Amino acid sequence: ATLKDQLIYNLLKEEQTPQNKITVVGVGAVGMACAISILMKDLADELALVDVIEDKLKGEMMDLQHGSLFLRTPKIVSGKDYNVTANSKLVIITAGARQQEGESRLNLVQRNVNIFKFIIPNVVKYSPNCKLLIVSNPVDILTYVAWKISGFPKNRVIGSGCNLDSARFRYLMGERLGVHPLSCHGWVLGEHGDSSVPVWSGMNVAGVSLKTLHPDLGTDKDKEQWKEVHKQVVESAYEVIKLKGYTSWAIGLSVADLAESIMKNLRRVHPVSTMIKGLYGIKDDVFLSVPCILGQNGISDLVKVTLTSEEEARLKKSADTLWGIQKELQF
Amino acid sequence: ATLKDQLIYNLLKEQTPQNKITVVGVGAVGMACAISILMKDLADELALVDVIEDKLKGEMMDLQHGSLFLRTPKIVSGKDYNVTANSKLVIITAGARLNLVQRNVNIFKFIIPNVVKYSPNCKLLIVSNPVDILTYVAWKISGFPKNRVIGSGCNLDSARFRYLMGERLGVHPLSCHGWVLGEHGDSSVPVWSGMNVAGVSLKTLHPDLGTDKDKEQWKEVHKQVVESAYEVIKLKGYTSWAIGLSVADLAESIMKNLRRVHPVSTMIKGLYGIKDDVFLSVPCILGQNGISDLVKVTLTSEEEARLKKSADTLWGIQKELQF
Amino acid sequence: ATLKDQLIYNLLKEEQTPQNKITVVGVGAVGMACAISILMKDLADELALVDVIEDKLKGEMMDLQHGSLFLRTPKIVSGKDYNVTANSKLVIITAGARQQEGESRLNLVQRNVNIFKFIIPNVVKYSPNCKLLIVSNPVDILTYVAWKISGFPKNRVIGSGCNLDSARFRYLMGERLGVHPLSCHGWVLGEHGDSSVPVWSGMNVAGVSLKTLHPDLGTDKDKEQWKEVHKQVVESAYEVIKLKGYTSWAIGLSVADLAESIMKNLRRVHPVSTMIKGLYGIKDDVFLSVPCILGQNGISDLVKVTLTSEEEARLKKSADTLWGIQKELQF
Amino acid sequence: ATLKDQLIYNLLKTPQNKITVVGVGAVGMACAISILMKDLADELALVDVIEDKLKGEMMDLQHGSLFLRTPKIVSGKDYNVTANSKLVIITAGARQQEGESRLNLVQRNVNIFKFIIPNVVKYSPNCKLLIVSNPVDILTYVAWKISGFPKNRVIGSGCNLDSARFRYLMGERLGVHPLSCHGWVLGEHGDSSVPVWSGMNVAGVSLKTLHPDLGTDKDKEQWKEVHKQVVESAYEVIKLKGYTSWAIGLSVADLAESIMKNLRRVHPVSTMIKGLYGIKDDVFLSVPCILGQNGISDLVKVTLTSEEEARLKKSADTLWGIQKELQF
């Protein structure tokens, strides 16, 4: 008898699948922020990591494993081979090229589509019943791409979308009003990018319409220049990229928020990238953010947000910009 | 009236934060400490300091953008230490990662008096390496009592040990007990007599535990505590996540006055035949006043000699330092 | 010599003040549900319990202490003497007497005044700078009573008010819509319980006003009978009391949420009872629920909700009734 | 045309982490709130035979849903509400009656289990059963026999609470958080439990080695009183408030955490111990067990003194003797 044998009597040796497995693909700044945020929210019983850079992948995995004492996720694995990802409930894709200073997210398309052509079939092979959560940019276009390549029903292909833009908007609104963002309500929809749409008509604190109180809210005639709040949301990534090189923490928290709703079947509403065909007269298979009910089967329902004529025109412009790109892609 | 005044009636107009933490140095380690402390709801105000102003602002903004998802309502930063005023706990992660030691000492000469100016009754938690030496340097420069100067020390080494023990036994690390003491890193000491599951001494069950003759080579578990760190540095360039979690665990005990026991670096002159002013890790009771008490572990002759060799080594270096 | 001294070397014996202390006065079902909820949210470093029933008090304290391994609140104390409450940041009052069959509201309030004349000066002696959170019913009147006796400024005397009523409303809204209550917004204001006011204009999902979509919402013309949601906010409480004898779990959760905002200085908005003289054409020193910003100094600000004529008349009628009782009280 | 359909466009018309609590007295409801506040389940079902109390408890929890992350709370007297539970916690018990014998009370609780357990098995044939109801070691045996489950799937709370109390009391003597005070109470829950003095330690420092009289009658510091206070403090709580609830509920939630999250942490829980310590009969006693998604997968073989082994053997003899007298 070995020490382990003398210490421990085994009742059964059976391999059971994990109950709540999450995979993150891409262990860069974003993937590792999503990983740590998910670990510290106790959302998974197994975390798997995938990348193409083998040394970085192993190092990241080890660094998280060394923290196991402080976590409640008892198995952390990694590998370049997608067999490590099998039986995942949720697969989060963060791999690919990121924006350089002054580059648009839309300049990343070719690079990141060609990565997805390899990643997505491999994910689907090993977790045919997972939900896919796309983070890689440009996130709305890549959500469309992941949906086309996977063959999944569209409820199971979810882009992180404007959950982050809306969190930024609420932070900025809170700063102006002296209220925690949790109590400042306001939605940013459409592209996660330059063409996003602030929904001024829905902004409120305690159910009190700010546009009703201040009819010029968001317009050029506004003495308080609330449009600058949305301009700051749009410019956020560019400033943070200029200062620190990339963004990571806010998106990691945003993704963990989405993962919480999916994994715990909460049926919370989040603005995430999905197919908008049938809303606002849009006929095209365009993906962009609208508020969606999220839970264990992904997106089960879309909220039909009432938009002003100007808000609706701006959303349709965002859809046109994205569809212009999405329609020319080759599969 | 502004929209704000139309919406909101003000009852009350100066607040002192009540549970504030500062992190100095927003590199990989300082930001891992920051996110971990944020996600554990330990502070009502988090301040960040660095000398690289753009990096600092960018890190601050990135955290602020996640405020909706957190319960820490104020995140601030600056190169000026006024931003750190009234911190309960100041965590120093600034550095490079004998000339190199002196360069981190040179950074401490600027950092420590600035911290003390703005938070004279904080607890100082030193993470920067070489951590046992820099904890001594921070103690000397600050003039703080020994209870309020704590090195992260072997808390991380012990967490690695417990992970690796758990992997061998098929038990979660929480239920695998074992202590790594002394110097952080290469010269640490695994206390084999204390390694246990459910109070069952593994050394009593398997008396060759830890020795050269052990058929199962349990000494490799300690070798891997040392070597797995260097492996992570080779593979990814640095370590960050585990130290960040370790630090947040220490912060939790201090902020919440838990009186949990952790192997952190403390001024140990007067124990184990140690006769110089050096900091080594021993199990310490941590709470709101820092280290209030420590556990006197019974050590073998060999273990005591290893701590004494470490103290001689540390002291050798410290007597050469200029500050 | 002792085993303790052989094992542990003491560095300093300095006497410590707790930094984040909470007291609960009254350890009936409601006080204990508050206690457990606060304990399981890691809001306090010390929890003190007070009651007049000495055996019950000690037994509750001990039972909680036996669970210490599972908690992160290192000191739990109790006693009939208020010295155990010293230096509390937050003092929660759940003590009082329950209405008897055939007892007038004035008589019942006067009995609770008498009990508060015992409790409140002793709280103030030991925690002169605490925030007081009054849960005891009738809560809006007893918040006024606590304010008068304590001598505290308005910002530091808070009634739990309609925070529970609103949480019930959001549950019931969520059940009808198939959406988590976190994503169902709506506010019940005014008097806790029977006379509360559902603010239909603020009821929304994702900023979309239900009343705008369905103008008959809340009226007798409504074929979907949404008024029944508010009827059930009132009646479901009576129903729980009929079925189990009292209510406890929900109020405990709601109080812990208030305590979280106060203890962490969040500046979240909650519908709690505050002195409302000077709003809505109210002229008397009465306390009613409006959305208030809660943080480390208690209520720092309040939201001025736009009310319909009927809603405003209901608040004024409540103010009249409450003042009519208050003017007859003997302090 | 309905408001719901004007607001929401539907794309799609079982729970994955469901827990049931059977018996909604103070213990059951303390287990429930603790499990809810730890986000361990996506669905919680409650069962009792007292229909009004059951419905009221359910409603009161539902009213707190805004503050929780468990989106479905259900109840009923019919076990269809318990279907597809991962973990079923039994906190049901008979009310003590003035003048009844101990053996009579045990048999009445056995009769309750005869109704409950087959109903649990019908609707969640693949669950883990966690038995809290007293006498816990006997009733865990009973549930194992009636259910026909393999032993890894029938777990008694056992000495889990006793050990928590012990660590609390040790922490109070030493001025250290109970998290950092280690020590195990094994065997039977309650009066006949066994304090394992050899395992008592802080930071891996054996208190027995420092203080060889520890736990004996010779001991000037009377550390034996720490163990006596474990059961005496329990009975004191019952005298004072009428029952115990919060510590049990927290300790049960900790067990549920290890099982639901597959943690493989070690807890002293009651398990079928025949074949250890020279025990020859089908009895359940508490030893340190590794808990995860398959229940008890492994257990720790604590080295005991001759005197400690003889205590466990005497407990086994006692339990088997009672189990023969029970009808089920």
Ligand SMILES: NC(=O)C1=CN([C@@H]2O[C@H](COP(=O)(O)OP(=O)(O)OC[C@H]3O[C@@H](n4cnc5c(N)ncnc54)[C@H](O)[C@@H]3O)[C@@H](O)[C@H]2O)C=CC1
């Ligand atoms: N949706 C959103 O709100 C946000 C999206 N992003 C996007 O996230 C993505 C990742 O950004 P970072 O993590 O900062 O970049 P990074 O450069 O730090 O990491 C990217 C990782 O992807 C890996 N990768 C590349 N090809 C791969 C393949 N075929 N399979 C597996 N892994 C592969 C790389 O080896 C690298 O480790 C970018 O597209 C970025 O624009 C970034 C921030 C916010």
Ligand SMILES: NC(=O)C1=CN([C@@H]2O[C@H](COP(=O)(O)OP(=O)(O)OC[C@H]3O[C@@H](n4cnc5c(N)ncnc54)[C@H](O)[C@@H]3O)[C@@H](O)[C@H]2O)C=CC1
């Ligand atoms: N004790 C432990 O167990 C561990 C300690 N460490 C140590 O943590 C330290 C930091 O490591 P990394 O974050 O990877 O290094 P890094 O190079 O990423 O970051 C160090 C930061 O310190 C800043 N800094 C430099 N001089 C400063 C000053 N005068 N004031 C304020 N900030 C200043 C730098 O600008 C930089 O942003 C190193 O000394 C490293 O060895 C790392 C891992 C484990």
Ligand SMILES: NC(=O)C1=CN([C@@H]2O[C@H](COP(=O)(O)OP(=O)(O)OC[C@H]3O[C@@H](n4cnc5c(N)ncnc54)[C@H](O)[C@@H]3O)[C@@H](O)[C@H]2O)C=CC1
């Ligand atoms: N605001 C709200 O939304 C809600 C308020 N409540 C109210 O909470 C209060 C407590 O309800 P329960 O716990 O069910 O009642 P309870 O009658 O069980 O408990 C009251 C406790 O107060 C104690 N007490 C009486 N006089 C005292 C004194 N002078 N000092 C200290 N303690 C004293 C009693 O001994 C008793 O233990 C009631 O007034 C009830 O209506 C209940 C639910 C919701």
Ligand SMILES: NC(=O)C1=CN([C@@H]2O[C@H](COP(=O)(O)OP(=O)(O)OC[C@H]3O[C@@H](n4cnc5c(N)ncnc54)[C@H](O)[C@@H]3O)[C@@H](O)[C@H]2O)C=CC1
């Ligand atoms: N293992 C441990 O360490 C501990 C165990 N306990 C035990 O927990 C149990 C419950 O304690 P309390 O809640 O105080 O008792 P209680 O008597 O208040 O509650 C028992 C509940 O079981 C229900 N019940 C009875 N027959 C039933 C049936 N056929 N189906 C469904 N439910 C039924 C009752 O109607 C009642 O609501 C007791 O056996 C007690 O000894 C308590 C503390 C510690």
Ligand SMILES: NS(=O)(=O)c1ccc(Cc2c(-c3ccc(F)c(F)c3)nn(-c3nc(C(=O)O)cs3)c2O)cc1
């Ligand atoms: N007992 S002592 O204070 O004299 C001492 C402590 C530590 C070391 C070696 C050492 C250094 C180091 C870095 C910069 C220096 F200027 C220096 F002198 C040393 N970093 N480091 C790391 N540890 C990790 C990890 O995750 O464990 C990541 S880096 C490590 O193990 C030697 C002596």
Ligand SMILES: NS(=O)(=O)c1ccc(Cc2c(-c3ccc(F)c(F)c3)nn(-c3nc(C(=O)O)cs3)c2O)cc1
């Ligand atoms: N605006 S006011 O201060 O005048 C006021 C407040 C409350 C009530 C009705 C009322 C009372 C009550 C108790 C004793 C009395 F003497 C009395 F007049 C009323 N308890 N209670 C409860 N609510 C629950 C729950 O879970 O919601 C459990 S009990 C409730 O809704 C009326 C007036």
Ligand SMILES: NS(=O)(=O)c1ccc(Cc2c(-c3ccc(F)c(F)c3)nn(-c3nc(C(=O)O)cs3)c2O)cc1
């Ligand atoms: N090894 S064994 O299964 O035969 C066994 C177990 C338990 C007891 C004594 C016993 C009983 C009990 C209750 C009903 C009975 F029919 C019965 F036989 C015993 N409840 N109880 C409690 N413990 C607490 C607490 O908070 O610890 C609250 S109640 C306790 O300590 C004896 C033998």
